[model samples]
Target chain A: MPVIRDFQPADIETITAIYTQAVLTGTGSYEIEPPTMDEMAKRFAAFADQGFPILVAEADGRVLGYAYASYFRVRPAYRWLAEDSIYIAPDAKGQGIGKLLLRELIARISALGFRQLLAVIGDGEHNIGSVKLHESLGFTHCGRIEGSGFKHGRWLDTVLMQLPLNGGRSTEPGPSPLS
Target chain B: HMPVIRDFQPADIETITAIYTQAVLTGTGSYEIEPPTMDEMAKRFAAFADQGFPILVAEADGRVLGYAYASYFRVRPAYRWLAEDSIYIAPDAKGQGIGKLLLRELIARISALGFRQLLAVIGDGEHNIGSVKLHESLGFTHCGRIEGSGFKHGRWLDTVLMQLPLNGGRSTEPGPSPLS
Candidate 1:
């Protein structure tokens, strides 16, 4: 069983491998080529710099999967909304690790005062697993853009799912420090 | 009377910034909470220019009444065929048909740029009735809404999305290079 926890610097290598696999063999990521280790590190650093939550699922000292939140859009008023990116190791599929990482990510971001979390699930049909994962965690299907992405030698649809956090906008929000 | 739509120029930055600031501070036309500094606006303007995207201005009696520009909807390579549209009219310039003039010209120019789709991410649709109606009036269809996706001005805001197909949108393969 994998335990969900915050990502650390030492987990970069395993994290890189997991993401690289997903990018190359799956429709989840549209990146045509795997980014170099340094490039991946820079992205990870930016997420940390922004104070968004980045978590990993680990079992037997192996990183099975990871999830993180980033600004849905950089505009200041969009500060309350965030998008999630999750990647799981190919060998670790069907173990429910993705749900664990995503569940913990939602908790952390909500705790951090974020009001909404969005999932731009790539390859809507082929990526049903991801869509289902987000739905299981209380995200509702909101909208979809057909053929919005092209990868893996075909046009791909992007499925958008959203989950409101901490009562979402039903209540007035506090000062937006992130803005 | 119809305002003249013209290509954006360096001189328009200050007025553009002011108009954008007005929308950011009190209107749901943009999601920006605090207006960016002139320096930031200059950089953004230049970046869009570098991509060959059109930034247009509406001129009525030589005063910049409003501005419109197209930017990448997403940074992903596969999403290159799509662009997001933003328009802001000066507080004093509203209800004068400047928005309609600028938007029509923006659509014409963007279609000529070879973009396949144009998306409008109208801020606070529940309260921003004008922006939603404006986009709908220009042939945009409702994509969906992100309920309570924004927080500002002491209340929760919703983001309404509308999209317009441009230049045979999704019906033809893109040219060798998008915006080429």
Candidate 2:
């Protein structure tokens, strides 16, 4: 049985391997080339520095999949909002690893003070698992751009899924936090 | 140094349109394929009018040296605090401290008006050093690089963005649906 838990410092290698595979082998992201080992290390540290959760799914204590949210666009004001990503090893996919990862992602993020989330899932004709996972998780179907974004020689329609975490708090849609 | 940052008057439209039109035609700093027709420009301008944000001008001797302005970054009602910043300096005024002067004031003024963050999605390969330097000098930081995102001037374009945080918790906003 796979247990969903926090990432351990010792799991860097496994985490990097998972990201590399997602970029190189899957259409999950638009990374044309896999990041170097050093880049992965740099990325790991950056994620921590920014206070994002990088988690792993372990089966009997072996890392099989991971998920984390990074700077959606790097703006500091959209701080409570995040763009999320989930990556599972090809062999570990088709199982429920993905659902578990997303489930944990939302639960953890809400408690962490995130009020909104956007999921831009690759609409590769070959891979729609992300879209399915997002839907199953209660993300509102916002809109779709048939080819707003392209990758891998064909136009990739991006699926935008929106989730409101804070119950649209503050009915007035308050002014920017200049206070 | 003190800078003059104030919204434009009716007279500034022709010049503002000219600068933007040149940017459109030269693809100097934007991917917009064609210059916006005057009607389109008016519509775009009107939205900013509704918001009460300025289409500020920096100048001397009646010549429109440069302009910096803000527009909504996203349409969602929840995204009210975010805005996109666009700057245009007279082609001849590229140097001479005009762009930086306009931006420094723009950043402070917008922040003062209660905006929580600003987004600058720069042109792929066209923005010259002076422009990028202006953004960096004003505390804007590059967030990510997207490759081959734009096709302009018969070449692939790489898009870069700078995100400036006006307050804490800007990076960790609400997670989109299913994220709840």
Candidate 3:
């Protein structure tokens, strides 16, 4: 078993490895080309600068998984909402690391004034692990974006799984804040 | 310099405001006091964050002379592929091919982005010959018109709905990823 802790700048080398492996090998993202470490670092900075925690699961000092929640947008109206992402190392699969990492991320974001959270798992037809984890944690089927993500020599779909941390209203387009 | 169409940056918010402010006060487009603030624009920006829709601007001599961008035509999920585009040229920047440049580039960009349906919510009155003529020359087909949909400068303003199909066919389910 590995311990999960806050991510450090040095851990990025391992984290980038996991991320690129998943991007290159799996249907997790719609990216066609594997991202570089520099791209990964720019992405990490977006969350870290906002004070969001990037937790890494490590075994014997080797990073095996990671998760975090960043701002869905810079707007104050969306301040209470977050979009989450998690990735597990390729070799550490089938040990329930994804479930552990995702659960911890949900708990932390819920505590951070985020009333609603969203995760865009792989297209619903493919990723069973994503479906099971989200369902077990009470994330309802928000919706599906068909043919949304185009990559990997073809188009891919995106499944939206939504969880209301404490409680929230429906995803309705409300009246303007200024009105 | 030739005009360029690209994503909206924090730098162009002031230009966007200036164009929209005139449209609002003059009863040309919207019926609001002023244009959306940068924060408000970013909220709209986030909805299309995944697609990276560019808020293209037409520039001349290092100034924003005009701008264009597309976003969700509606809030519903089924309308995801349907996009609404807006093109605004500085009152001075009007004519001189700026509006045409902005619209032409936006059409090309959104088409490449997998969007199929495009609508231009035109904010012109019945006798607004200039706007009507410009849109016609740009290959927009007038689908419908509304009466007095907006009011600002002491009278009601009508709106024209223009439609253009970017693609002829798309999947009904389109892969079933779980959109509403």
Candidate 4:
């Protein structure tokens, strides 16, 4: 089993490389340009400052994949909901690294007392792996916005999948400890 | 006389703030627990206006009755073409057709500005049928429902999603950034 643990500063380079490849080649992220390393670091710092979790999967001293939870929306009322983002190295596909990273991500966010987790998968029908991955982890199709994004010379759809957490909306929630 | 819809002015913030406070305290159209102060409301209005999004108000006999605006659906640049609509009417102004008038003007202006999609995230879901019907009457379709997404007014509440496509929608490539 791959070891999953919190991300370190040294892992930023490898993770940035992983995400750059995704931005340049895959339809998972809609960014037209790969963000600079400084930008990615700032993002990590912001998540850390807010007590959100960012984790990395490792094997034999090398990072294979990374995942993190971020606000689904910035509104205060949407505070209990989180959106998850995961990216794997180009050479690391189909190795179950994504599953390991996401499982740990879910457990950590659930421990943080979030009530819902959403995965906004880009390139809707074409990104079957991501859709199937979320479905395998008990996520249900909540909504889909077709042709909302334009990338790579073709229109793309955004698929919204959701998973309930920490008893979900079954009961009233107390004020979140992590704002 | 019919209420006239016009561009929001700096002096209209006070009335807009009051109307939003009423919605926050007495209605489920918004999930906000506490009403924002006038200063905070001004900052929000400026945020949209600075981005060149449309913010309009409805006036009847020289008094503001309702307001509407389209804000970025998501902050990411990729979602730039998608916008979200927020409309609030004064408590005493209900059933006067102010909401429909404000929404119609908002749609026309935002569409003219080249937005591709407009969504309404109606709080309290089916319970807020007036908002649901208003969006439906304006050609917005039921997109999705999120169960128990909010807790307000002593109970859990849901959010109803409605979407309206505009300006050729996804049929063609988007023009240069409207903000640019």
For model 1 the TM-score comes to 0.94
Q: Any runs in candidate 2 off by more than 4 Å, and if so which?
A: A124-126, A145-149, A169-179, B1-62, B65-180
lDDT of each: 0.84, 0.66, 0.66, 0.86
Top TM-score: which candidate number? 4
Regions of candidate 3 where Cα sits further than 4 Å from its true position? A169-179, B1-68, B71-109, B112-180
lDDT tens digits, residues A127-177, model 1? 889999998999998877666666666667778899988778778777663
Best candidate, lDDT-wise? 4
lDDT of 4 by residue, A1-179 (tens): 68999999889899889999999998889887899998999999999898999999999888999999998766567778889999999988999988998898999999988888889898888999999999999989887776667777777788888888988888778886385
What's model 1's lDDT at A20? 86
TM of each candidate vs. truth: 0.94, 0.51, 0.57, 0.96
Please report the candidate that would top DockQ against the real structure: 1
What lDDT is obtained when candidate 1 is compared to the true structure? 0.84
Off by over 4 Å in 4: A177-179
Candidate 1 segments whose C-alpha is farther than 4 A from its true place? A177-179
Query: Can you write out model 3's per-residue Cα lDDT over A81-137, one digit (the tens) per residue?
Result: 577787889889898887888888887876665556777676556787888888888
Query: Which docking class does model 1 fall in?
Result: medium
TM-score of chain B taken alone, candidate 4: 0.96
Worst 10 residues of 2 chain B by lDDT: B171-180
